Amino acid sequence: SLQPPPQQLIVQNKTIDLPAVYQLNGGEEANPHAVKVLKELLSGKGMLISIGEKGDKSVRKYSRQIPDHKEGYYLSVNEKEIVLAGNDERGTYYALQTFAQLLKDGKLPEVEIKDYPSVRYRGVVEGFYGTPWSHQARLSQLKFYGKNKMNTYIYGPKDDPYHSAPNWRLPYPDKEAAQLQELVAVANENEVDFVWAIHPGQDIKWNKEDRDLLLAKFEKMYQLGVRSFAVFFDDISGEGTNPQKQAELLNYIDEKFAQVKPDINQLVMCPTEYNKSWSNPNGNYLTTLGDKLNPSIQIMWTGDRVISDITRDGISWINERIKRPAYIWWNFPVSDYVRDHLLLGPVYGNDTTIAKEMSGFVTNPMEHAESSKIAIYSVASYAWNPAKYDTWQTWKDAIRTILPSAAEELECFAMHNSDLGPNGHGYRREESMDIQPAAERFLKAFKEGKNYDKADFETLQYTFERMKESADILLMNTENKPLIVEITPWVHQFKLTAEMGEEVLKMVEGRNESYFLRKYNHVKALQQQMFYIDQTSNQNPYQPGVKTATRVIKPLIDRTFATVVKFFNQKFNAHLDATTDYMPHKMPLQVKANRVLISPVEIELDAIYPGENIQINAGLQKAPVKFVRQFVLTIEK
């Protein structure tokens, strides 16, 4: 079950045993990163094992089987010998990572593998807004990239003041600097290019002073061990957006720094026009870059829109203007504009035949580093072997990789936490696809008053039961504590969702008047609990709170609840309230942080608050306020 899937694989239906008696060959002269891993795998343990790079004495016999590609390797296992041979040092390390996935309980299959990546640079750009990844999280990421053959980590958290304006001019303080030094050492050991990016555009002056401060900063990062560099000009305005100046600065960094040090690897830039919708097809910006930028400098691209999947026509369009294959910055699973959602679905939508048209493929992920590993593991597989990329199987493999102790539970949670909900970027993902038809029918019948299928009722019922099992097991899981810490508030909200659905379904059955009323009041309590989570957890300034199962599950529950309530009201001349989200203030009102808003004559708050201002479309100077007669009211809470 190899991830990424190799270019070529020939399996023999025999198996062999990892030799306790073995002779090692090429150990001294192969990539030391690859040898270390081999030795960990052969721990406390005569069969021939030959390891080396094309050109080493050890692997002379196989030089014609080693693929002629950067990062390529040949791998083979039989009764007599094991071969691990890279076109180059990174290739040998990649052989070892493939070999590690073949070893299962001291047993190896008989296989012959020729393998190499279809895309040259593959990995992660930590390039989102929000809380930057923790130091420990980054340490974990770099190991994960090594294991999955991602060779690129671009460091560029938008809210790191030493990366963006104005402190991009200042060297990192000692503590952050020793942490970065450590990240580079760890990157180098897992064969990952640590790429340090800088984001100076918003207040850069095009003078010598700013140019030398930038080069002075790159020099300080070089002292920390950094060997690849990027300059980002995304999401800025003003003079920094000038294409001629941008190119001159980049060429100057190229000529006076990248092409002058002994050992610099990647030099990459991100344009102000970084996707088609944000480009001016009649303006000179992209063609200037394409014509003026030195040919070894990479140019990044997010596709047809800020958030978008990569199409053949889309990348043709950019490649023809920039005069080189774009280096893709893919904006998924980044959730910095839908901060109340987790995006845990599969990676899909990118053309799988366009490898030759791209220099690079990196994923911009969520501020939730462990949770992002599902998409990241999948991107590593897509970028290495797009031809064979399998969306759903890779998603499942990622999950079982990340949380083998509770894979089905995490699968359950992930598959109902995938869509983004409505947003201004217009990007959406599928969610809850398996149960969607059953949901769809149940709610057709029910609404129009025709009878639903029992098996559809039970499917819904089975799902809620499963959700509860997953939520509870994930909450207590101690295999990946950092992952659990990330998802926990979502897990609680997910459990509540499932209980609400069970209770709403008990209302549909509805023995008698007083059963129905017990169920109904329970539902109301559960709504209120969801509100309290949504108001107390993840209270960020942009999209505060906690949404889950939003595409299919919550709407089905809400709409079912509103419906039974209405039938009951008719049948009993009752006046039960049918509203679906709890709201403590009377008038659809909404609560966000200290705001109280009627969704874009009179409001009554659950209490007297000091008021702050009322924006329709006046300051309230702390006046006590309970009644009020865009429409956002801000209070002190």
Side-chain angles (χ1 to χ4, degrees):
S1 190
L2 300 175
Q3 286 287 9
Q7 302 294 343
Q8 202 202 287
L9 163 66
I10 300 167
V11 48
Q12 304 302 337
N13 279 29
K14 319 191 163 62
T15 56
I16 285 132
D17 280 325
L18 189 72
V21 57
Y22 71 82
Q23 165 161 192
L24 183 39
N25 205 280
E28 271 308 303
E29 306 85 352
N31 182 344
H33 306 147
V35 174
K36 200 178 214 304
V37 176
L38 184 54
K39 283 172 170 166
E40 286 159 20
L41 283 180
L42 266 38
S43 204
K45 267 185 137 48
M47 196 174 183
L48 190 44
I49 306 185
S50 295
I51 189 160
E53 286 73 56
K54 190 185 190 54
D56 290 354
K57 289 201 195 326
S58 69
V59 301
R60 283 174 300 185
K61 192 185 162 54
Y62 327 91
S63 62
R64 283 169 43 89
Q65 289 140 349
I66 306 177
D68 190 36
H69 299 259
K70 295 213 184 119
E71 320 179 332
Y73 61 94
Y74 171 73
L75 181 154
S76 164
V77 198
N78 53 40
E79 41 281 302
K80 70 146 193 192
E81 63 155 314
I82 297 168
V83 180
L84 301 160
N87 206 37
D88 53 35
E89 304 183 332
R90 211 170 250 169
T92 311
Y93 184 80
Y94 294 160
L96 267 293
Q97 292 301 344
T98 291
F99 176 78
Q101 298 176 73
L102 308 156
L103 193 62
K104 268 145 205 197
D105 293 295
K107 293 179 179 179
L108 291 158
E110 292 217 336
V111 277
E112 160 150 324
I113 288 165
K114 303 175 182 185
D115 195 12
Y116 57 83
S118 306
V119 180
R120 172 51 182 106
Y121 305 113
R122 315 167 295 290
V124 174
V125 54
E126 172 171 355
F128 52 77
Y129 298 88
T131 294
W133 282 348
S134 71
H135 184 68
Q136 283 305 320
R138 293 167 176 144
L139 284 168
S140 186
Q141 293 289 314
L142 293 162
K143 296 160 203 179
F144 195 68
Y145 308 160
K147 286 188 187 302
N148 294 291
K149 309 191 173 78
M150 277 181 150
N151 60 7
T152 296
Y153 168 63
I154 309 183
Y155 180 100
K158 291 280 186 294
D159 301 328
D160 172 7
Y162 299 96
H163 162 75
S164 204
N167 289 1
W168 67 256
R169 278 163 197 103
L170 284 175
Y172 281 89
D174 289 338
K175 194 192 121 186
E176 281 78 9
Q179 286 176 321
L180 293 172
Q181 199 169 284
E182 192 185 19
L183 299 179
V184 174
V186 176
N188 291 339
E189 290 178 39
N190 288 282
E191 294 298 335
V192 174
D193 277 338
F194 187 105
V195 185
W196 193 80
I198 194 160
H199 189 256
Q202 188 55 51
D203 71 351
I204 195 167
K205 286 136 226 141
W206 299 117
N207 58 18
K208 270 182 217 185
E209 184 185 357
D210 263 354
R211 170 179 285 201
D212 316 329
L213 285 158
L214 188 149
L215 266 304
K217 180 66 162 281
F218 272 16
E219 177 68 36
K220 289 310 254 292
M221 309 308 307
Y222 189 97
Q223 280 147 25
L224 295 173
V226 176
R227 298 297 183 269
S228 312
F229 292 84
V231 188
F232 290 170
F233 297 97
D234 55 323
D235 293 348
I236 63 176
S237 57
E239 270 326 290
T241 65
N242 181 318
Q244 176 65 39
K245 288 302 184 201
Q246 283 181 2
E248 273 169 25
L249 170 79
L250 267 299
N251 288 352
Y252 179 84
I253 292 155
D254 190 27
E255 291 159 15
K256 275 68 187 170
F257 181 78
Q259 309 291 300
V260 160
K261 291 298 192 186
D263 52 353
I264 281 173
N265 295 309
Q266 307 183 44
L267 174 65
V268 174
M269 67 94 79
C270 186
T272 299
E273 292 183 12
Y274 62 79
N275 66 84
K276 194 169 168 230
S277 75
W278 275 37
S279 171
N280 184 0
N282 298 299
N284 298 124
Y285 176 102
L286 280 162
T287 54
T288 293
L289 286 192
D291 286 331
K292 295 310 214 300
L293 265 168
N294 288 352
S296 52
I297 300 162
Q298 307 310 312
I299 300 164
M300 297 185 105
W301 190 244
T302 74
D304 294 314
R305 296 191 62 167
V306 171
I307 320 300
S308 84
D309 299 341
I310 303 309
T311 70
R312 183 175 282 288
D313 292 354
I315 203 176
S316 295
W317 188 95
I318 181 64
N319 287 357
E320 201 214 299
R321 289 162 176 70
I322 56 158
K323 310 313 227 310
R324 65 210 74 198
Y327 192 115
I328 300 294
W329 176 313
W330 188 48
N331 277 315
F332 175 89
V334 55
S335 57
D336 62 23
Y337 59 98
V338 284
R339 290 195 202 187
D340 54 357
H341 293 249
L342 295 181
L343 310 181
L344 302 187
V347 158
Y348 67 90
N350 301 306
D351 190 306
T352 53
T353 65
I354 58 177
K356 289 185 195 160
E357 318 305 328
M358 66 192 36
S359 287
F361 197 99
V362 302
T363 166
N364 192 24
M366 304 168 269
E367 63 172 273
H368 315 296
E370 303 292 331
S371 305
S372 286
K373 286 178 168 168
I374 306 174
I376 289 152
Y377 177 112
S378 294
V379 177
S381 175
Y382 163 85
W384 184 276
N385 199 335
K388 287 166 65 107
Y389 178 64
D390 183 339
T391 304
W392 283 104
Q393 185 56 217
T394 302
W395 180 82
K396 291 179 192 279
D397 293 346
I399 287 167
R400 170 154 252 111
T401 300
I402 294 166
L403 208 68
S405 59
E408 275 129 35
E409 287 78 10
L410 172 60
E411 266 189 57
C412 179
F413 183 65
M415 55 160 329
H416 308 303
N417 278 106
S418 283
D419 189 18
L420 293 70
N423 56 84
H425 288 307
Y427 192 84
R428 303 293 301 258
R429 302 276 85 187
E430 302 203 326
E431 184 179 276
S432 308
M433 277 302 288
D434 294 326
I435 60 95
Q436 208 263 341
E440 271 230 347
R441 278 187 310 264
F442 175 85
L443 210 35
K444 63 177 172 61
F446 209 72
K447 281 164 66 47
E448 62 191 26
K450 323 182 135 162
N451 296 287
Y452 59 86
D453 182 0
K454 208 45 176 47
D456 282 3
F457 184 92
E458 302 187 340
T459 293
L460 299 188
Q461 206 154 249
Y462 159 75
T463 298
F464 303 150
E465 186 176 14
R466 263 303 275 175
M467 295 175 62
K468 298 202 310 192
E469 284 166 32
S470 311
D472 288 332
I473 282 154
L474 290 178
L475 275 179
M476 293 297 102
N477 180 274
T478 54
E479 186 170 49
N480 192 343
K481 267 133 164 177
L483 172 64
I484 307 307
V485 165
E486 304 177 14
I487 65 167
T488 272
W490 282 269
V491 175
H492 291 314
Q493 199 65 305
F494 185 79
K495 184 172 182 179
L496 285 167
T497 295
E499 298 187 276
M500 184 173 300
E502 278 175 348
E503 283 307 272
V504 167
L505 287 183
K506 273 158 184 202
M507 292 166 59
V508 173
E509 281 176 322
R511 281 70 116 151
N512 51 82
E513 181 166 359
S514 92
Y515 191 71
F516 180 98
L517 279 159
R518 282 165 49 203
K519 295 300 105 172
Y520 168 92
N521 290 326
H522 193 185
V523 169
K524 301 313 263 181
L526 288 175
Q527 296 173 359
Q528 255 175 263
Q529 285 179 49
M530 298 191 61
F531 177 83
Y532 166 89
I533 298 177
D534 188 50
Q535 297 296 156
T536 61
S537 281
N538 184 36
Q539 289 310 291
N540 69 85
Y542 310 104
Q543 302 89 44
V546 184
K547 314 298 187 288
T548 192
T550 64
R551 207 183 161 90
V552 172
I553 295 167
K554 186 54 158 55
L556 158 69
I557 298 164
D558 288 341
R559 292 175 177 200
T560 307
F561 172 82
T563 293
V564 296
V565 166
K566 173 176 67 49
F567 294 161
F568 174 104
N569 279 355
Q570 291 165 340
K571 174 162 183 207
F572 294 89
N573 290 62
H575 294 92
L576 285 195
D577 167 36
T579 67
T580 49
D581 280 319
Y582 175 75
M583 185 43 58
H585 310 128
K586 294 140 138 63
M587 196 270 274
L589 290 173
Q590 285 185 66
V591 170
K592 297 279 171 220
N594 65 346
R595 298 174 289 287
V596 177
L597 58 103
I598 321 166
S599 313
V601 197
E602 168 163 353
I603 299 172
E604 178 195 328
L605 314 174
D606 68 350
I608 300 166
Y609 297 88
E612 261 155 34
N613 67 294
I614 316 155
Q615 314 185 199
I616 320 175
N617 155 357
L620 294 174
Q621 304 176 302
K622 305 295 195 199
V625 66
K626 168 173 176 136
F627 302 86
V628 162
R629 184 174 73 198
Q630 180 190 236
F631 203 96
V632 172
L633 169 67
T634 304
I635 55 194
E636 176 200 293
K637 215 168 76 281

